[PDB]
Amino acid sequence: FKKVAKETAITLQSYLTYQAVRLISQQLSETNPGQAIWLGEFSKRHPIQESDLYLEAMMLENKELVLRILTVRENLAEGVLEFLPEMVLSQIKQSNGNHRRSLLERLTQ
């Protein structure tokens, strides 16, 4: 399923961008409040959903912060990605079983 895989990987990359930004925001609130609010204001003007454009914009407005975001995103990716295939497949099987059981019990009782 090449198309599905490619679209999912793009989605996953954007989502890990969002997670990296979330972590940095938390850290900034404790160590650099001025930057925490700057990032808050930037995120209101640029949708993180469009992550490539988000990062390219910040490259022009705050290069030091985007480099931190890119470093944190790669560390997150490296740490968490290989957990996902087993977690997601096991979650989906369990969720499929629960819904099939719920369905079977309606039809039968």
* Interface with Zn ion (CB under 5 A): 45, 52, 56, 64, 74, 85, 96, 99
Q: Are 28 and 36 spatial neighbours (Cβ–Cβ below 8 Å)?
A: yes
Residue nearest to Zn ion (CB): 99
Q: Are 87 and 95 spatial neighbours (Cβ–Cβ below 8 Å)?
A: no
Map the footprint of a copy of itself across residues 38-67, applying CB under 8 A.
Answer: 52, 55, 59, 63, 66-67
Rounded to a whole number of angstroms, the minimum distance from the CB of residue 37 to a copy of itself is 23
Distance, C-alpha 42 to centroid of its chain: 18
**83 lies in the binding site for a copy of itself (CB under 8 A):** yes
Helices (H), 1-109: 2-31, 33-45, 51-61, 63-80, 84-108
**Gap between the Cα atoms of 89 and 100, Å rounded:** 16
Please give the residue ranges that form the binding site for a copy of itself (CB under 8 A). Answer: 1, 4-13, 15-16, 19, 23, 52, 55, 59, 63, 66-67, 70-71, 73-74, 76-85, 87-89, 91-93, 95-96, 98-100, 102-103, 106-107
